[PDB]
Amino acid sequence: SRHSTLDFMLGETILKGLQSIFQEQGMAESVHTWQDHGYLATYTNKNGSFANLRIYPHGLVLLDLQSGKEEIDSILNKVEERMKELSRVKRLPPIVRGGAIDRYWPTADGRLVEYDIDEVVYDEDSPYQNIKILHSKQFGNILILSGDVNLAESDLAYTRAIMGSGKEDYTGKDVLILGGGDGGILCEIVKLKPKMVTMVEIDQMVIDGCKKYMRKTCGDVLDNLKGDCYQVLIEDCIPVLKRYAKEGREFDYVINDLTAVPISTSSTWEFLRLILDLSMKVLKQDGKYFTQGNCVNLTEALSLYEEQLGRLYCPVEFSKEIVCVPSYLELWVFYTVWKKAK
Amino acid sequence: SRHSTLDFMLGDGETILKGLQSIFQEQGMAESVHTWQDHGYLATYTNKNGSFANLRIYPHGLVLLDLQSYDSILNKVEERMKELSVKRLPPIVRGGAIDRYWPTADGRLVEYDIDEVVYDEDSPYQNIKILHSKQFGNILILSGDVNLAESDLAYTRAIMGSGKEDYTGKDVLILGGGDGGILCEIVKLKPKMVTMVEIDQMVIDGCKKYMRKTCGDVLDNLKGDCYQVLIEDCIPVLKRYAKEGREFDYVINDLTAVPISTTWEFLRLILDLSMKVLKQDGKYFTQGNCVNLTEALSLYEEQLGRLYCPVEFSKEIVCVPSYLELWVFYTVWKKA
Ligand SMILES: CSC[C@H]1O[C@@H](n2cnc3c(N)ncnc32)[C@H](O)[C@@H]1O
Numbered sequence: 001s002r003h004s005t006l007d008f009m010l011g012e013t014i015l016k017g018l019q020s021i022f023q024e025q026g027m028a029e030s031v032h033t034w035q036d037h038g039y040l041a042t043y044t045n046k047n048g049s050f051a052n053l054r055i056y057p058h059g060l061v062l063l064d065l066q067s068g069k070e071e072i073d074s075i076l077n078k079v080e081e082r083m084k085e086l087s088r089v090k091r092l093p094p095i096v097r098g099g100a101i102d103r104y105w106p107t108a109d110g111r112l113v114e115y116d117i118d119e120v121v122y123d124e125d126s127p128y129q130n131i132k133i134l135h136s137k138q139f140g141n142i143l144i145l146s147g148d149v150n151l152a153e154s155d156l157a158y159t160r161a162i163m164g165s166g167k168e169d170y171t172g173k174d175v176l177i178l179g180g181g182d183g184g185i186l187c188e189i190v191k192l193k194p195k196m197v198t199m200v201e202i203d204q205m206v207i208d209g210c211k212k213y214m215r216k217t218c219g220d221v222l223d224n225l226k227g228d229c230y231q232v233l234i235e236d237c238i239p240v241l242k243r244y245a246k247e248g249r250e251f252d253y254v255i256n257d258l259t260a261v262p263i264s265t266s267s268t269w270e271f272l273r274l275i276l277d278l279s280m281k282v283l284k285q286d287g288k289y290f291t292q293g294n295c296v297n298l299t300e301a302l303s304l305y306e307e308q309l310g311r312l313y314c315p316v317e318f319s320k321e322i323v324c325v326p327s328y329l330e331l332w333v334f335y336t337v338w339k340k341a342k
Numbered sequence: 343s344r345h346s347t348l349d350f351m352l353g354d355g356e357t358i359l360k361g362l363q364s365i366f367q368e369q370g371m372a373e374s375v376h377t378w379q380d381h382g383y384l385a386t387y388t389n390k391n392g393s394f395a396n397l398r399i400y401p402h403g404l405v406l407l408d409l410q411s412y413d414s415i416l417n418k419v420e421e422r423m424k425e426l427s428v429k430r431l432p433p434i435v436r437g438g439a440i441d442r443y444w445p446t447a448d449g450r451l452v453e454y455d456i457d458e459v460v461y462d463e464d465s466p467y468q469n470i471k472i473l474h475s476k477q478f479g480n481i482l483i484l485s486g487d488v489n490l491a492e493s494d495l496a497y498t499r500a501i502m503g504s505g506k507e508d509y510t511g512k513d514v515l516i517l518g519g520g521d522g523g524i525l526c527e528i529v530k531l532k533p534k535m536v537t538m539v540e541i542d543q544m545v546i547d548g549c550k551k552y553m554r555k556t557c558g559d560v561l562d563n564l565k566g567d568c569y570q571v572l573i574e575d576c577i578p579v580l581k582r583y584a585k586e587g588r589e590f591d592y593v594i595n596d597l598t599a600v601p602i603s604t605t606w607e608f609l610r611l612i613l614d615l616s617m618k619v620l621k622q623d624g625k626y627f628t629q630g631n632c633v634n635l636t637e638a639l640s641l642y643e644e645q646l647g648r649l650y651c652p653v654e655f656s657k658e659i660v661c662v663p664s665y666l667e668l669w670v671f672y673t674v675w676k677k678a
């Protein structure tokens with residue numbers, strides 16, 4: 001479950017130099033020789049540890065160890081000293097495999113990143129989604145929904161951007177929030193004296209988790225679903241969006257803070273187009289819609305998202321901004337959408 | 343080269359192995375198995391195309407799979423595994439021409455979106471890399487330590503005091519500064535004289551070419567109306583300035599994490615010499631370290647109270663885009 005690696009990039013001899021080290025440790029060897037692809041040598045230890053040593057023909061040498069800790073540290077050290085005599089080196093941090101505390105959460109653009117996580121605070125499946133809250137030293141508690149990092153206690157920048165980056169005056173305004181169960185936006189918007197904020201969150205268990213564990217993002221705003229100038233509704237935002245349109249209710253601001261794949265109990269792109277149509281129908285002619293776009297590098301996904309903006313019952317314009325959100329480890333795009341003036 | 347991984351965590355070993363060895367055999371891969379008394383199994387599969395697979399089975403329901411490969415296999419495994427009762431991280435590219443893996447100060451493995459080696463040379467002092475990131479722009483990496491990216495204006499804003507300082511008519515010393523970031527931004531602010539003391543000319547000359555979003559045109563001339571660059575070790579320069587009794591409004595220590603010499607006593611020395619050339623009512627700014635390295639940061643705070651004179655300090659945590667970790671920036675000044 002501890003997997004160590006060692007890479008050598010150079011310009012049979014290497015095998016003969018390295019083999020020695022493994023015999024010296026009492027490990028048993030078996031070599032597979034390839035016609036013009038070099039060698040694979042496997043090394044098994046009594047204690048149930050093993051090493052793989054791949055030697056490609058063009059001077060690429062890769063070594064793996066799997067697992068007492070110091071033994072292997074020292075063995076990799078022996079491999080470096082020996083390779084110095086025999087003559088680029090890469091010795092990445094070992095990867096824990098099957099740890100009780102899971103540190104690896106790839107970015108939306110498919111990059112491998114290890115987080116500074118020391119404690120599983122919350123891990124529960126809800127009717128809709130897996131919900132984890134993992135503690136980071138630097139990032140505080142982090143909310144992770146269906147394996148996608150949503151927000152850490154450090155990510156005020158996300159909230160700032162989806163709120164229009166300080167350009168908007170929320171004083172006495174009517175606001176709708178879709179999703180947003182971390183309480184981030186609701187917490188910050190309520191300090192600003194809106195007339196009324198409505199947040200529609202389908203998953204009570206996300207709120208439960210966040211109220212207890214992300215208080216540095218939501219403060220106390222999530223303790224009562226109903227407050228001075230705000231209400232939290234536990235339902236699917238789709239039907240709520242329809243009700244509001246049907247009664248012809250409109251808002252100054254609509255803020256879509258759903259997960260990347262919204263939750264449905266009723267293709268993914270049609271769904272996004274649907275929410276936009278509904279949000280527009282309840283958005284004041286002179287109002288604004290804000291939402292999270294995607295990471296900067298998912299250009300095809302950003303491009304398909306903007307096709308949906310062109311597919312709505314009404315013409316709209318939009319602006320984009322790139323924002324650095326601390327726990328994301330990839331820059332993120334946020335959208336501002338508005339109705340085209342008649 | 344391409345090294346894929348598949349991890350199964352569970353709540354019988356021989357049954358799993360037996361269930362699995364079909365897929366590999368179905369590919370023409372030869373097999374050897376290593377059996378342990380109460381340690382589980384190791385299966386190794388070889389393909390004449392040069393790829394291989396490791397199938398490690400622990401007796402307590404840990405099934406680990408490796409593959410390389412200069413996919414469908416991995417898919418085909420996950421399918422069978424569901425029947426027999428999961429972590430499938432992005433494969434790591436090993437020994438690639440373009441190196442994407444640049445670990446954090448606290449020792450975490452992060453992968454960058456690097457798609458070009460722009461510049462890679464050894465100077466007499468350090469190895470200097472400039473690598474292109476799709477989202478960060480060009481990133482300057484000195485001895486495998488990520489120093490600054492074209493996106494990292496926040497670092498530069500922070501190390502200049504976060505907009506609290508007024509630089510007009512002021513006298514400024516910079517230590518290091520080879521990427522030209524602070525230099526380009528301070529010169530904008532009508533200072534009296536900025537002096538930057540960078541030891542490695544080669545860092546200036548790579549940045550001049552490849553990091554213009556951070557440095558602009560400021561590294562095109564080493565003297566300007568309100569600045570000058572000296573290409574030497576800041577040490578002899580700091581001593582010389584003390585001897586002449588030269589004193590500065592601000593001293594900005596923009597050094598590499600491990601300053602260059604021809605540990606803690608050295609950092610102390612730099613603090614000492616900067617303090618000697620610091621005006622009584624001045625300020626010294628510097629980068630500290632990542633928030634996680636608390637021993638390092640504490641060991642550094644210890645040195646602040648080991649200088650010729652008494653000093654006070656404050657610190658702030660900053661988000662620098664390409665760093666992939668939060669960073670602490672120090673502000674130090676002489677006790678009243
Ligand atoms: C953490 S902010 C993301 C929130 O959006 C919520 N969400 C996802 N889909 C829907 C939906 N259709 N209606 C309301 N909330 C949703 C998720 O449950 C999550 O708490």
Ligand SMILES: CSC[C@H]1O[C@@H](n2cnc3c(N)ncnc32)[C@H](O)[C@@H]1O
Pocket residue numbers: 482484489517518519520521539540541542545546574575576577596597598600601602603
């Ligand atoms: C990238 S900005 C960091 C800079 O600090 C510079 N540096 C490191 N040590 C010293 C030193 N002793 N004197 C002057 N500059 C230095 C490095 O050459 C680099 O350009």
